[PDB]
Structure formats: structure tokens, C-alpha cells
Short mmCIF file of C-alpha atoms and ligand atoms in Angstrom, two decimals:
data_model
loop_
_atom_site.label_atom_id
_atom_site.label_comp_id
_atom_site.label_asym_id
_atom_site.label_seq_id
_atom_site.Cartn_x
_atom_site.Cartn_y
_atom_site.Cartn_z
CA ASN A 1349 -14.37 21.73 -4.62
CA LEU A 1350 -12.29 22.58 -1.39
CA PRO A 1351 -14.33 23.72 1.49
CA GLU A 1352 -14.83 27.43 2.20
CA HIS A 1353 -13.35 27.03 5.83
CA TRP A 1354 -10.09 25.75 4.44
CA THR A 1355 -7.38 28.34 4.27
CA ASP A 1356 -5.36 29.34 1.20
CA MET A 1357 -2.52 26.74 0.37
CA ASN A 1358 -0.39 28.59 -2.02
CA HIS A 1359 -1.62 26.14 -5.10
CA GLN A 1360 -0.21 22.94 -2.63
CA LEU A 1361 -2.64 19.82 -2.33
CA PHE A 1362 -1.54 19.07 1.49
CA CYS A 1363 -1.37 21.17 4.63
CA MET A 1364 -1.69 20.87 8.39
CA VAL A 1365 -3.03 24.05 9.59
CA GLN A 1366 -3.09 24.79 13.43
CA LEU A 1367 -6.26 26.44 14.65
CA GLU A 1368 -6.45 29.74 16.58
CA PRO A 1369 -7.68 29.02 20.31
CA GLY A 1370 -10.90 30.90 21.37
CA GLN A 1371 -12.18 31.03 17.59
CA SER A 1372 -15.50 29.50 16.69
CA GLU A 1373 -13.90 26.48 14.75
CA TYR A 1374 -11.29 25.59 17.46
CA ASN A 1375 -13.94 26.13 20.12
CA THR A 1376 -16.49 23.56 18.36
CA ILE A 1377 -13.87 20.79 17.98
CA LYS A 1378 -12.69 21.48 21.32
CA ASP A 1379 -16.11 21.05 23.01
CA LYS A 1380 -16.74 17.86 21.10
CA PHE A 1381 -13.51 16.47 22.98
CA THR A 1382 -14.25 17.95 26.40
CA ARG A 1383 -17.71 16.44 26.21
CA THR A 1384 -15.84 13.19 27.74
CA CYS A 1385 -12.25 14.13 28.10
CA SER A 1386 -12.51 17.39 30.30
CA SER A 1387 -9.79 16.12 32.59
CA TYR A 1388 -6.92 16.04 29.54
CA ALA A 1389 -4.79 19.28 28.72
CA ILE A 1390 -5.22 20.22 24.78
CA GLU A 1391 -1.80 21.39 23.55
CA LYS A 1392 -3.06 22.14 19.98
CA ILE A 1393 -5.74 21.23 17.23
CA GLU A 1394 -4.93 21.17 13.53
CA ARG A 1395 -7.04 21.19 10.49
CA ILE A 1396 -6.08 18.56 7.93
CA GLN A 1397 -6.38 20.10 4.48
CA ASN A 1398 -5.68 17.03 2.02
CA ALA A 1399 -7.00 17.74 -1.30
CA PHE A 1400 -6.89 14.19 -2.88
CA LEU A 1401 -8.30 12.48 0.20
CA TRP A 1402 -11.22 15.00 0.45
CA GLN A 1403 -11.83 14.43 -3.36
CA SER A 1404 -12.25 10.64 -2.76
CA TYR A 1405 -14.30 10.89 0.08
CA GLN A 1406 -16.58 13.46 -1.25
CA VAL A 1407 -17.23 11.05 -4.27
CA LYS A 1408 -18.09 8.03 -1.75
CA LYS A 1409 -20.52 10.32 -0.03
CA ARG A 1410 -22.20 11.50 -3.10
CA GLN A 1411 -22.51 8.07 -4.21
CA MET A 1412 -23.73 6.85 -0.91
CA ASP A 1413 -26.30 9.54 -0.89
CA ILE A 1414 -27.95 8.27 -4.10
CA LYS A 1415 -27.75 4.40 -3.18
CA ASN A 1416 -29.46 5.19 0.16
CA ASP A 1417 -31.81 7.53 -1.31
CA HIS A 1418 -31.36 10.07 1.79
CA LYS A 1419 -28.37 12.23 2.81
CA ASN A 1420 -27.83 11.21 6.38
CA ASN A 1421 -25.11 8.91 5.83
CA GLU A 1422 -22.17 11.00 7.87
CA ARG A 1423 -21.23 11.01 11.56
CA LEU A 1424 -18.37 12.70 13.32
CA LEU A 1425 -16.34 10.08 15.34
CA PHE A 1426 -12.88 9.82 17.02
CA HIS A 1427 -9.58 7.67 16.23
CA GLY A 1428 -6.80 7.32 18.68
CA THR A 1429 -3.34 6.30 17.21
CA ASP A 1430 0.50 6.10 17.95
CA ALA A 1431 2.75 8.94 16.97
CA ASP A 1432 4.32 6.73 14.50
CA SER A 1433 1.05 6.58 12.45
CA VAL A 1434 0.43 10.05 12.35
CA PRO A 1435 2.20 11.08 9.11
CA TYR A 1436 0.80 8.29 7.19
CA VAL A 1437 -2.95 9.19 8.26
CA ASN A 1438 -2.58 12.74 7.65
CA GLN A 1439 -1.34 11.72 3.92
CA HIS A 1440 -3.07 8.54 3.22
CA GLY A 1441 -5.99 8.37 5.93
CA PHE A 1442 -7.10 4.80 7.44
CA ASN A 1443 -5.96 1.64 6.31
CA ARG A 1444 -7.77 -1.50 7.41
CA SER A 1445 -4.27 -3.54 6.15
CA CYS A 1446 -2.55 -1.73 9.05
CA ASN A 1447 -5.39 -4.34 19.06
CA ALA A 1448 -8.80 -6.39 19.04
CA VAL A 1449 -11.11 -6.43 15.83
CA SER A 1450 -14.04 -8.53 17.46
CA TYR A 1451 -16.66 -6.75 15.31
CA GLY A 1452 -14.62 -7.24 11.80
CA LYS A 1453 -11.44 -6.53 9.93
CA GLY A 1454 -11.81 -2.92 9.23
CA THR A 1455 -11.00 0.74 10.73
CA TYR A 1456 -12.44 1.41 14.35
CA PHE A 1457 -14.11 4.77 15.29
CA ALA A 1458 -15.45 5.79 18.78
CA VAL A 1459 -18.54 7.76 19.34
CA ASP A 1460 -16.91 9.17 22.66
CA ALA A 1461 -13.34 10.75 22.71
CA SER A 1462 -12.91 9.04 26.12
CA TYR A 1463 -12.71 5.62 24.28
CA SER A 1464 -10.11 6.53 21.97
CA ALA A 1465 -8.04 8.43 24.88
CA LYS A 1466 -7.18 5.01 26.27
CA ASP A 1467 -3.37 4.28 25.92
CA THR A 1468 -3.89 1.37 24.07
CA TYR A 1469 -5.22 3.41 21.16
CA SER A 1470 -3.52 7.15 21.60
CA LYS A 1471 -0.31 5.69 22.83
CA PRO A 1472 1.65 8.36 24.75
CA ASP A 1473 4.96 9.06 22.94
CA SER A 1474 8.52 9.51 24.52
CA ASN A 1475 7.33 13.03 25.53
CA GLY A 1476 4.07 12.16 26.99
CA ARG A 1477 2.10 13.50 24.30
CA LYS A 1478 -1.31 11.56 22.90
CA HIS A 1479 -2.93 12.01 19.27
CA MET A 1480 -6.61 11.69 18.40
CA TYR A 1481 -8.33 12.29 15.09
CA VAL A 1482 -11.75 13.90 14.60
CA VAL A 1483 -13.21 12.03 11.50
CA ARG A 1484 -15.98 12.52 9.12
CA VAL A 1485 -17.14 8.87 8.62
CA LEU A 1486 -19.85 7.40 6.06
CA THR A 1487 -21.45 4.98 8.65
CA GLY A 1488 -24.72 4.98 6.19
CA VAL A 1489 -26.84 2.01 6.82
CA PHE A 1490 -25.39 -0.15 9.84
CA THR A 1491 -25.83 -3.75 11.49
CA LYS A 1492 -24.18 -5.38 14.22
CA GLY A 1493 -20.64 -6.70 13.61
CA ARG A 1494 -18.94 -9.94 14.37
CA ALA A 1495 -15.48 -11.46 14.32
CA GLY A 1496 -13.76 -12.24 11.17
CA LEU A 1497 -16.02 -10.10 8.70
CA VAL A 1498 -13.95 -8.58 5.72
CA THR A 1499 -16.72 -6.37 4.38
CA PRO A 1500 -20.16 -5.44 5.98
CA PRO A 1501 -23.06 -8.08 5.73
CA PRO A 1502 -25.69 -8.25 3.05
CA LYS A 1503 -28.99 -6.44 3.92
CA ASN A 1504 -30.80 -9.53 2.53
CA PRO A 1505 -28.73 -12.86 1.53
CA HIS A 1506 -31.23 -12.93 -1.26
CA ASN A 1507 -29.00 -10.25 -2.83
CA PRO A 1508 -25.80 -11.08 -1.47
CA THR A 1509 -23.71 -8.01 -3.19
CA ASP A 1510 -26.20 -5.30 -1.74
CA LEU A 1511 -24.03 -4.61 1.55
CA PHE A 1512 -24.57 -2.44 4.74
CA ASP A 1513 -22.31 0.59 4.54
CA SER A 1514 -20.73 -0.11 8.09
CA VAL A 1515 -21.16 -2.20 11.47
CA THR A 1516 -21.31 -1.45 14.96
CA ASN A 1517 -21.32 -3.04 18.51
CA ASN A 1518 -24.78 -2.13 19.43
CA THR A 1519 -27.50 -1.14 16.67
CA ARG A 1520 -29.88 0.66 19.16
CA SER A 1521 -27.22 2.51 21.03
CA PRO A 1522 -23.72 2.36 19.00
CA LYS A 1523 -20.50 3.43 20.69
CA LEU A 1524 -18.19 2.15 17.87
CA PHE A 1525 -18.42 2.06 14.15
CA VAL A 1526 -16.10 -0.35 11.74
CA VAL A 1527 -15.54 0.76 7.86
CA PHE A 1528 -14.03 -1.77 5.54
CA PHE A 1529 -13.12 0.53 2.32
CA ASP A 1530 -10.68 3.20 1.75
CA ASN A 1531 -12.13 6.81 1.49
CA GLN A 1532 -15.30 5.88 3.69
CA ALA A 1533 -13.42 8.25 6.44
CA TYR A 1534 -11.74 11.84 5.94
CA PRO A 1535 -9.41 12.77 8.93
CA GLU A 1536 -10.29 16.24 9.57
CA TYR A 1537 -8.82 17.46 12.76
CA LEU A 1538 -5.74 16.30 14.68
CA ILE A 1539 -5.95 16.84 18.73
CA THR A 1540 -2.60 16.65 20.34
CA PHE A 1541 -3.11 16.24 24.20
CA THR A 1542 -1.76 15.01 27.58
CA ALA A 1543 -3.57 13.45 30.34
CA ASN B 194 -18.00 11.33 -16.64
CA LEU B 195 -19.64 7.93 -18.16
CA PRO B 196 -18.07 7.06 -21.65
CA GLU B 197 -20.22 8.07 -24.70
CA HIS B 198 -19.99 4.71 -26.30
CA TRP B 199 -21.31 2.72 -23.22
CA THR B 200 -25.26 1.41 -23.55
CA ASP B 201 -27.60 3.95 -22.26
CA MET B 202 -28.44 2.41 -18.78
CA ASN B 203 -31.78 4.36 -18.34
CA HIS B 204 -31.28 5.59 -14.53
CA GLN B 205 -29.40 2.12 -13.65
CA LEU B 206 -25.75 2.23 -12.15
CA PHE B 207 -24.69 -1.15 -13.33
CA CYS B 208 -24.89 -3.50 -16.58
CA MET B 209 -23.08 -6.13 -18.23
CA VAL B 210 -23.10 -5.92 -22.13
CA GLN B 211 -22.44 -8.82 -24.56
CA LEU B 212 -20.18 -7.82 -27.45
CA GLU B 213 -20.55 -9.09 -30.97
CA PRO B 214 -17.71 -10.98 -32.70
CA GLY B 215 -16.16 -8.70 -35.78
CA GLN B 216 -16.43 -5.49 -33.82
CA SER B 217 -13.25 -3.87 -33.38
CA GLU B 218 -14.12 -3.81 -29.39
CA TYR B 219 -14.36 -7.61 -29.37
CA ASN B 220 -11.57 -8.34 -31.76
CA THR B 221 -8.88 -6.24 -29.96
CA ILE B 222 -9.63 -8.37 -26.54
CA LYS B 223 -9.72 -11.57 -28.35
CA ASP B 224 -6.33 -11.07 -29.98
CA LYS B 225 -4.79 -9.80 -26.73
CA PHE B 226 -6.16 -13.10 -24.87
CA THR B 227 -5.02 -15.32 -27.93
CA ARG B 228 -1.45 -13.92 -27.85
CA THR B 229 -0.58 -16.47 -24.95
CA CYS B 230 -4.03 -18.79 -24.63
CA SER B 231 -4.65 -19.91 -28.20
CA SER B 232 -5.36 -23.57 -26.89
CA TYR B 233 -8.46 -22.19 -25.12
CA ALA B 234 -11.93 -21.04 -26.80
CA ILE B 235 -13.67 -17.79 -25.76
CA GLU B 236 -17.59 -18.35 -25.19
CA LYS B 237 -18.40 -14.53 -24.76
CA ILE B 238 -16.83 -11.02 -23.78
CA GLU B 239 -18.97 -8.55 -21.70
CA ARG B 240 -18.24 -4.83 -21.26
CA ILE B 241 -18.67 -4.18 -17.55
CA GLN B 242 -20.54 -0.86 -16.97
CA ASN B 243 -20.25 0.13 -13.34
CA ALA B 244 -20.81 4.01 -12.79
CA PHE B 245 -19.68 4.14 -9.18
CA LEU B 246 -16.45 2.00 -9.62
CA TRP B 247 -15.73 4.01 -12.86
CA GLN B 248 -16.15 7.30 -10.86
CA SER B 249 -13.77 6.49 -8.17
CA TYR B 250 -11.12 5.00 -10.52
CA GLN B 251 -11.06 8.00 -12.73
CA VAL B 252 -10.71 10.23 -9.48
CA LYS B 253 -7.71 8.02 -8.49
CA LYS B 254 -6.25 8.16 -12.21
CA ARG B 255 -6.62 11.97 -12.08
CA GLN B 256 -4.69 12.38 -8.99
CA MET B 257 -1.90 10.10 -10.05
CA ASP B 258 -1.46 11.81 -13.41
CA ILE B 259 -1.14 15.09 -11.39
CA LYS B 260 1.39 13.46 -8.80
CA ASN B 261 3.56 11.84 -11.30
CA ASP B 262 5.63 13.58 -13.85
CA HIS B 263 4.39 12.72 -17.43
CA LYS B 264 3.99 9.22 -16.69
CA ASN B 265 1.76 6.54 -18.64
CA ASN B 266 0.19 5.28 -15.22
CA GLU B 267 -2.39 2.85 -16.57
CA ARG B 268 -1.70 -0.62 -18.05
CA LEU B 269 -4.41 -3.08 -19.21
CA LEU B 270 -3.71 -6.31 -17.33
CA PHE B 271 -5.56 -9.57 -16.75
CA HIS B 272 -7.13 -11.29 -13.44
CA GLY B 273 -8.31 -14.80 -13.14
CA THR B 274 -10.86 -15.68 -10.65
CA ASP B 275 -13.68 -18.33 -9.55
CA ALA B 276 -17.20 -18.32 -10.57
CA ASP B 277 -18.18 -17.47 -6.88
CA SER B 278 -16.24 -14.46 -7.00
CA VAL B 279 -17.81 -12.85 -10.26
CA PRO B 280 -20.67 -11.30 -8.72
CA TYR B 281 -18.76 -9.38 -6.21
CA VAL B 282 -15.99 -8.07 -8.49
CA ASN B 283 -18.71 -6.99 -10.97
CA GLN B 284 -20.25 -4.73 -8.34
CA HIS B 285 -17.55 -3.80 -5.93
CA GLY B 286 -14.26 -4.45 -7.94
CA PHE B 287 -11.00 -6.02 -6.32
CA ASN B 288 -10.76 -6.37 -2.52
CA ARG B 289 -7.21 -7.15 -1.31
CA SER B 290 -8.80 -8.42 1.95
CA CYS B 291 -10.35 -11.47 -0.14
CA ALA B 292 -7.07 -12.07 -2.24
CA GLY B 293 -5.25 -15.54 -1.96
CA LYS B 294 -1.61 -15.91 -0.99
CA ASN B 295 0.11 -16.01 -4.36
CA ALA B 296 2.65 -19.04 -5.29
CA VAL B 297 5.41 -16.16 -5.62
CA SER B 298 4.58 -13.61 -3.01
CA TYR B 299 5.50 -9.85 -3.95
CA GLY B 300 3.32 -8.59 -1.28
CA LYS B 301 -0.36 -8.92 0.25
CA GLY B 302 -2.59 -7.26 -2.51
CA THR B 303 -4.40 -7.83 -5.43
CA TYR B 304 -2.38 -9.56 -8.37
CA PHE B 305 -2.71 -8.72 -12.09
CA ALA B 306 -0.99 -10.59 -15.09
CA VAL B 307 0.71 -9.11 -18.17
CA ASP B 308 0.13 -12.20 -20.07
CA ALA B 309 -3.46 -14.18 -20.18
CA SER B 310 -1.64 -17.53 -19.86
CA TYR B 311 -0.94 -16.75 -16.28
CA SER B 312 -4.37 -15.79 -15.22
CA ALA B 313 -5.59 -18.92 -17.47
CA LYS B 314 -3.93 -21.40 -14.83
CA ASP B 315 -6.73 -23.31 -13.11
CA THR B 316 -5.26 -21.94 -9.59
CA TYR B 317 -6.70 -18.66 -10.65
CA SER B 318 -9.48 -19.08 -13.16
CA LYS B 319 -10.93 -22.20 -11.53
CA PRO B 320 -13.31 -24.10 -13.77
CA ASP B 321 -16.84 -24.09 -12.61
CA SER B 322 -19.43 -27.16 -12.41
CA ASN B 323 -19.87 -26.42 -16.16
CA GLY B 324 -16.33 -26.31 -17.32
CA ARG B 325 -16.34 -22.52 -17.84
CA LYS B 326 -13.25 -20.44 -16.56
CA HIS B 327 -13.47 -16.66 -15.93
CA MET B 328 -10.96 -13.71 -16.63
CA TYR B 329 -11.30 -9.92 -16.32
CA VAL B 330 -9.46 -7.53 -18.37
CA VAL B 331 -8.74 -4.66 -15.97
CA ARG B 332 -7.59 -1.04 -16.28
CA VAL B 333 -4.71 -0.81 -13.57
CA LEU B 334 -2.87 2.40 -12.17
CA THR B 335 0.47 0.75 -12.00
CA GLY B 336 2.07 4.52 -11.70
CA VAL B 337 5.73 4.13 -10.65
CA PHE B 338 6.76 0.67 -9.42
CA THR B 339 9.71 -1.31 -7.85
CA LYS B 340 10.18 -4.99 -7.04
CA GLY B 341 8.06 -5.98 -4.24
CA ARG B 342 8.83 -8.35 -1.23
CA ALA B 343 6.47 -10.87 0.49
CA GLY B 344 6.16 -8.72 3.85
CA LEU B 345 4.41 -5.78 2.19
CA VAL B 346 0.85 -4.52 2.90
CA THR B 347 1.54 -1.09 1.11
CA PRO B 348 3.78 -0.24 -1.60
CA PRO B 349 7.06 0.62 -0.02
CA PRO B 350 8.75 4.32 0.17
CA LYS B 351 10.75 5.63 -2.82
CA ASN B 352 12.99 7.20 -0.07
CA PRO B 353 13.68 5.63 3.23
CA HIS B 354 14.02 8.93 4.93
CA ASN B 355 10.35 10.13 3.76
CA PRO B 356 8.22 6.78 4.83
CA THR B 357 4.99 8.07 3.53
CA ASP B 358 5.93 8.86 -0.08
CA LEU B 359 5.06 5.59 -1.82
CA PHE B 360 5.41 3.92 -5.04
CA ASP B 361 2.31 3.23 -6.81
CA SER B 362 2.24 -0.64 -7.24
CA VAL B 363 5.17 -3.26 -7.21
CA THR B 364 6.10 -6.08 -9.65
CA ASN B 365 8.22 -9.09 -9.85
CA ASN B 366 10.82 -7.84 -12.11
CA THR B 367 11.50 -3.95 -12.86
CA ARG B 368 13.11 -4.77 -16.19
CA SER B 369 10.58 -7.51 -17.55
CA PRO B 370 7.51 -7.12 -15.62
CA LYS B 371 4.95 -10.10 -15.73
CA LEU B 372 2.82 -9.34 -12.63
CA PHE B 373 1.62 -6.31 -10.67
CA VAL B 374 0.26 -5.98 -7.17
CA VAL B 375 -1.91 -2.97 -5.88
CA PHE B 376 -2.82 -2.45 -2.06
CA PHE B 377 -5.76 0.15 -2.63
CA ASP B 378 -9.24 0.18 -3.54
CA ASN B 379 -10.21 1.83 -6.69
CA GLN B 380 -6.68 1.48 -8.28
CA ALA B 381 -8.09 -1.26 -10.94
CA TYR B 382 -11.27 -1.04 -12.95
CA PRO B 383 -12.82 -4.32 -14.08
CA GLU B 384 -13.55 -3.46 -18.05
CA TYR B 385 -14.33 -6.86 -19.60
CA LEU B 386 -15.29 -10.30 -18.32
CA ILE B 387 -14.03 -13.38 -20.74
CA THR B 388 -15.90 -16.58 -20.21
CA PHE B 389 -13.88 -19.21 -22.16
CA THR B 390 -13.48 -23.33 -21.86
CA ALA B 391 -11.23 -26.10 -23.14
O1 LIG C 370 -9.76 5.21 18.73
C1 LIG C 370 -9.60 3.87 18.15
N1 LIG C 370 -8.30 3.56 17.51
N2 LIG C 370 -8.09 2.73 17.28
C2 LIG C 370 -8.70 1.54 17.44
O2 LIG C 370 -8.44 0.44 16.91
C3 LIG C 370 -9.93 1.59 18.26
C4 LIG C 370 -10.65 0.28 18.44
C5 LIG C 370 -12.06 0.55 19.15
O3 LIG C 370 -12.75 -0.43 19.57
C6 LIG C 370 -12.08 -1.63 19.52
C7 LIG C 370 -13.18 -2.81 20.00
C8 LIG C 370 -13.64 -2.18 21.42
C9 LIG C 370 -14.87 -3.25 21.92
C10 LIG C 370 -14.11 -4.66 21.98
C11 LIG C 370 -13.71 -5.18 20.44
C12 LIG C 370 -12.64 -4.20 19.77
C13 LIG C 370 -12.25 1.92 19.48
C14 LIG C 370 -11.44 3.20 19.05
C15 LIG C 370 -10.18 2.95 18.59
#
């Protein structure tokens, strides 16, 4: 059930597709980044076409839409990483088992590209290049996190196994989200850029 | 995609079904257990019907069936646990983030035993305040495996020059496997819960 805007993959199940500058899709992703990172230079934007990761993510989306009884469970967020982690994320997505983790032992995503653009996250490589993903994240129903969580808290400790979907730094005005399960986040675009 | 022999759950996403001694379904699990645990006695065997865990696991199985040549990717293995963990495993499955360090570590992941006698150790199936021990019977996507190492947080690569193309699982011994370790969510479906006593 591969999305229409994906380009043909000659019957393969993984491809990184470089976007054409000045076309609709590239302009949309560039604008999301330049909202907070207009001082940075974009070398390229690639679309991640990973059929298996997409399948597993879409199953978790359909389940969360049923569980929560509404369809507003997805946000587009940013994730900076080092060059040596890019092949793993492209093929396998995000892994909590692989910086501060003050809101719990999960994978962190930023609302603002400027946060992910810090050298501690998007570490410049031996050529000065920095790497940041644009990510579809199933944030669903969220609560404030805290140090040492291995899953989100329960919604009511009367039923300890009915969990929040994610945690955040601030519930009224979130700037980051943490997810604790595989296939709750789909890396959709990779931005390669310089300071 | 829910199996046609499951009980009708009437819109519900989750149910535990108590099996009847003398049914083939009960007897096969009883025999699999008693092969190595004939000193213990079974109280009851429950079929775990968890729609979401089943969906996510069957998607992973179809993907491993495509990726691997013509491999039998699935084994039926045992997992002992404490009573405090049973409600979470029934609803959410096996979380590597909650796993203990094993007395012989082949990596940081969830451990599954070939023999019920391994899982029947008090270290894993801790007796509760009523002297009941709990063991799951689990469908596990072992796939293509190699001998593990204590340092691992994912299975190792098949080829050191292609670090992202990974083994599916690791074992203690490739020639005579007695334990498997998996490192990803929805690679194991808790199928039956055995409640047993001395
Ligand atoms: O883009 C990111 N890539 N990798 C991260 O680990 C990461 C982490 C992150 O917030 C970490 C949080 C910040 C406030 C204090 C506690 C810790 C935000 C973005 C990122």
C-alpha cells in the first residue's frame, strides 16, 4: 500500500530518492526547515522509500486511531544525527537501545529544526556536512516525562497497562516528544546541510 | 487477519481463553512442557488473543519470509516471568527495556528457551505469594541466527563491510541452540500462558 508521491522502485523495497529543487515536495520540506534554520545551507533533500518500515508504521497508526477513537495522532518532527548513524536509520528507523535522556529512555524528536541543528545532535562530519531527518511520529495522547521512564506512564494507575502514547517536556507548549516503541516513527526525508 | 479458531471477542481487542484438558490444543502444550518439566503440575493453560500484538507480529513474519530465502523463520519457545510482569506481557508483549541481565549473557535483549525446564527455574518463573509459577509459550521470529556476545544491543551484521544487513536473532550455540535473544518489538507473540505449581 505504498504512497502515490513515492516514485517507482523497479520492484525493490528500499530506495533513497533525491528531490528536485523548486518542485512542490522539495519546497514544502525546505520551508519546514527554513522556519527556524534560514541561516543554514541545504545541499540536498532525499525521500526515504522504505516499504517494510512504512508497513509497520501504518499498522501502528491504524491501531492508535482505533484505540484513541480519533485520527489526530501524527506530528511531523525533526531528528539530528551523526553521519555514522544515517545508514542504520534509513534501513531500520529509530532505536531507543542506541546525549541526555532526562524525559525517559526513548527516541527524542524536536518541534523546531533549530534544536536538532545543534552540533551535539547533527554532528558535522569530516567534510562539515550535518544530517537531520523529517519524521512522521505517532505522538497520540501525551503527558510530561521524567528521568528513568522505560515506557510512557499510565493514563490512570487504576489500570496500569493503558499507557500514554508518548511524553513531552511541556504539555501546554511542547518542544520535544519521546517515543518508547519501534515503528512509532517513520523517517520520511533526510536533509543534508551546512552552517 | 484474526485466526478463525479464536473465540468471538465481540468488538474487544483482547481476551484470555481457558483451555480444556483432552482438547488437542491443551494436550500439545502440556506435552511440550512435560518433556522437560515432569516434576511440576499445570494448574491451567490460557490462549492469549491480543489483536494488535498479532497484527504487528504477522507483518514482521511476512517481511522476514520475503527477505529470507525459504527459511522456517518461526520457533515455538518458552519464557518464564514473575506475576508482576504478566498483565504488561499479556497486553504489550516482550519489552527488551525491561529485561534482566541473564546469568550467561549473549546480548541485551529478551531471552527465550528451547526447553521449559530452563524457563521453570525460580530465577525466571518466580513463585508468587500463592506458590504459582508463570511461563509463556511464544511464537518467536528466530530467522537466520549466529552465536551472540554480551556487548550486543542489536543482532550483529552478517558481513562486517555491510554493517546494516543484520542477523535476525542470536543464540548460545549455533549447532545445539538452547536459548535465543531478540532485540526488536513485535518479533515475539505471547501465544499461551501456563500457570503451574510444585
Ligand atoms: O534531534 C535530536 N536528535 N537526537 C537527540 O537525542 C535529540 C534530543 C533532544 O532533546 C533532548 C532533551 C533536551 C532538553 C533536556 C533533556 C534532553 C532533541 C533533539 C534531538
